[PDB]
C-alpha cells in the first residue's frame, strides 16, 4: 500500500525537518590529507587570484613544524628517540688529536670514478 508507505515516509521527513541541527560553520580541515588540481595556463576561467586562507598558511607551517617545537611533552614512546637531538657540550671534534675520521686523498678521488 503506497498510500501508507508515503504516510510513514512523510512522518519520517517531519521527524528530521523538526529535529535536524546544522553543522555550525567551522570547516575543520585535516592537516594530513589534501590533494589538489592544477589550473589551465592561459584562460579567463582561472588566474583571477582568489584570496588565500591565512589560517591554512600558518597551519600547514604548524603541521610541518617538528615534534619538539610541536608537542611540549613526549606524547609517544617514539617521540622519546630523537627528542633531545641537539648534541651535548661542544664536541670540538675537528681537532684530530682524538678524532680519527677517514679523509679522501687524491688516489680515492680518482678511485671513486672507477668502473661506474
Amino acid at each position: 500500500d503506497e498510500v501508507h508507505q508515503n504516510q510513514i515516509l512523510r512522518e519520517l521527513y517531519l521527524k528530521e525537518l523538526r529535529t535536524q541541527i546544522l553543522y555550525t560553520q567551522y570547516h575543520v580541515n585535516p592537516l594530513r590529507k589534501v590533494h589538489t588540481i592544477a589550473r589551465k595556463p592561459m584562460s579567463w576561467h582561472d588566474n583571477l587570484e582568489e584570496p588565500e586562507d591565512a589560517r591554512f598558511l600558518n597551519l600547514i607551517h604548524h603541521a610541518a613544524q617538528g615534534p619538539r617545537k610541536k608537542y611540549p611533552e613526549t606524547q609517544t614512546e617514539s617521540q622519546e628517540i630523537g627528542w633531545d637531538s641537539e648534541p651535548l657540550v661542544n664536541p670540538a671534534r675537528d681537532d684530530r688529536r682524538l678524532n680519527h675520521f677517514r679523509v679522501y686523498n687524491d688516489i680515492t678521488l680518482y678511485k671513486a670514478k672507477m668502473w661506474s
Partner: protein
C-alpha cells in the same frame, strides 16, 4: 557559435520548456525583465545559443510555445518568467484538443502547424550555424503528440541536416491520464523513429521516485518534476554555452551514442541529487557522483538497467575538476558492470567536462544512456495496444476524423519491429 531552436508542443511541452528557460536564465544571469545582471562575463560570451540578442541590451529566448488549447500560454505568461517570451511565438489556437492524435495530425492541427512552421522558420533562419532543434512534448495525450509528430515530420524534411533533440514524456505503467494513450503512444513512435536523431524518453514514475527515494521531498509538485528534467536539459547542452575540456555538442554525442539508424531511443539521468537532510552528510566527489549516476534510482525512465545490456553510455560533467576521477572511475564502472555492457562495442562510455557547474553546486554530472532495456517501455506499451485494439474500441473517434484501420496495423508492426534489433543486441 551555434544556435538551438526550441519547440514546445502540448501542455507538458510548454510547461517543461518554461522550466527549461527558468533554469537556464538562472544559469545565464537574466532577470524576469530580460536585463542582464550577472557576475562572470563567461555567462554571456555564448549567450546567443538559446537567446536572441535584442536592442536595449536585453536578450529574448529563441523558442516557440505552441499549444492547441489557449490556456497554457496564458499560464506561462502569468508565470514567474512570463514577460520574457516573444509574443509573436505565442502560437495559440481556438479548437478542442480532446487528448487526440487524429485531431492534431489529420485535422485542424494541420491548419495550425503551417503557421507554426511560418513562425519557427524566422528564428530557425536568423542564425549563423544552427545545429538543430529541441522539441519538448509528451506521447500520452493530444496536442504534444498530434501537433508534435506532424511538426517533427515537416521540420525534418525541410531542414535535413539538423540534430533533433525531442525530449518526450513516455507513459507510466501505474497511471496514465489518457485512456486512448496506447493509441497515441504507438502512433507517435512510428513518426518518431524515422525522423528524430536524439529522442530522450522520460517516464513520470521514475520522475516521482527520485522525489521520495532520493530527493526526500515532502509534497512533490509538477514544478519540481519538471525542474529535474530541465536540470538534465542544461546538462545535455552545456559545452556550447560554457567552455571547458572535451567539449561535447549534439552531433558528437549522437555519433558516439546512437549505434544504428533505428537505435536512437535514450534514457537520461541527473545525479548530484541530495536530500535536504543528507546534503551536509555528503562528501561530494566524483566517485560518489558516479555511483549515484549508474544507480537504478536516478534513471528517469522506469526501467531496471539489469534487464538489458547498455549499448552506449555518455557522461557530461560540469564543474572544475580533474579527470582521473572521470576516466579511471568510468573504467571502474565498465569493469564491474561487465555483463551489463555489450561485448561487441568495447570502451562504450563517452566523456565531457565543462569548467563551470550549475549555480548552487560545485560538481554536476548528467548521464545519457542507450541500452536494450527500451523493451520495458515498448513491449510495455505494446501489450496494452494489442489488447486495446483487438477489441476495436476507443477507435470510432479516430476513424471519424480521417483515420482508417490499416495504418494502425502498420504502426503497431513498426513499433514492435523496433523491438527486434533491440532484442538481438541484448543477446548479440
Amino acid at each position: 557559435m551555434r544556435e538551438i531552436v526550441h519547440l514546445q508542443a502540448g501542455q507538458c511541452g510548454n510547461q517543461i520548456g518554461a522550466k527549461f528557460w527558468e533554469v537556464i536564465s538562472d544559469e545565464h544571469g537574466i532577470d524576469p525583465t530580460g536585463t542582464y545582471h550577472g557576475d562572470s562575463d563567461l555567462q554571456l560570451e555564448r549567450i546567443n545559443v538559446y537567446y536572441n540578442e535584442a536592442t536595449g541590451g536585453k536578450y529574448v529566448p529563441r523558442a516557440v510555445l505552441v499549444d492547441l488549447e489557449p490556456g497554457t500560454m496564458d499560464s506561462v505568461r502569468s508565470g514567474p518568467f512570463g514577460q520574457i517570451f516573444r509574443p509573436d511565438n505565442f502560437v495559440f489556437g481556438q479548437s478542442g484538443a480532446g487528448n487526440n492524435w487524429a485531431k492534431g495530425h489529420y485535422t485542424e492541427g494541420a491548419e495550425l502547424v503551417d503557421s507554426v512552421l511560418d513562425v519557427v522558420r524566422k528564428e530557425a533562419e536568423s542564425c549563423d550555424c544552427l545545429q538543430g532543434f529541441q522539441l519538448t512534448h509528451s506521447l500520452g495525450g493530444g496536442t504534444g503528440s498530434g501537433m508534435g509528430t506532424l511538426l517533427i515530420s515537416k521540420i525534418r524534411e525541410e531542414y535535413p541536416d539538423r540534430i533533433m533533440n525531442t525530449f518526450s514524456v513516455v507513459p507510466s505503467p501505474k497511471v496514465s491520464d489518457t485512456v486512448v494513450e496506447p493509441y497515441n503512444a504507438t502512433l507517435s513512435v512510428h513518426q518518431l523513429v524515422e525522423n528524430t536523431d536524439e529522442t530522450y524518453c522520460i517516464d513520470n514514475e521514475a520522475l516521482y521516485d527520485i522525489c521520495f527515494r532520493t530527493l526526500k521531498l515532502t509534497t512533490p509538485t509538477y514544478g519540481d518534476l519538471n525542474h529535474l528534467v530541465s536540470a538534465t536539459m542544461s546538462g545535455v547542452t552545456t559545452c556550447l554555452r560554457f567552455p571547458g575540456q572535451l567539449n561535447a555538442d549534439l552531433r558528437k554525442l549522437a555519433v558516439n551514442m546512437v549505434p544504428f539508424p533505428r537505435l536512437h531511443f535514450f534514457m537520461p539521468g541527473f545525479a548530484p541529487l541530495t536530500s535536504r537532510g543528507s546534503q551536509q552528510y555528503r562528501a561530494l566527489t566524483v566517485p560518489e557522483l558516479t555511483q549515484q549516476m549508474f544507480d537504478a534510482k536516478n534513471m528517469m525512465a522506469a526501467c531496471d538497467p539489469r534487464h538489458g545490456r547498455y549499448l552506449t553510455v555518455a557522461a557530461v560533467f560540469r564543474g572544475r575538476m580533474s579527470m582521473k576521477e572521470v576516466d579511471e572511475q568510468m573504467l571502474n564502472v565498465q569493469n564491474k558492470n561487465s555483463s551489463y555492457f555489450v561485448e561487441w562495442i568495447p570502451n562504450n562510455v563517452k566523456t565531457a567536462v565543462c569548467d563551470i557547474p550549475p549555480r548552487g553546486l560545485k560538481m554536476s554530472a548528467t548521464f545519457i544512456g542507450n541500452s536494450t532495456a527500451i523493451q520495458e517501455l515498448f513491449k510495455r506499451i505494446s501489450e496494452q495496444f494489442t489488447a486495446m485494439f483487438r477489441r476495436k474500441a476507443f477507435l470510432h473517434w479516430y476513424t471519424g476524423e480521417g483515420m482508417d484501420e490499416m495504418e494502425f496495423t502498420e504502426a503497431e508492426s513498426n513499433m514492435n519491429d523496433l523491438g527486434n534489433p533491440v532484442v538481438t543486441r541484448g543477446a548479440c
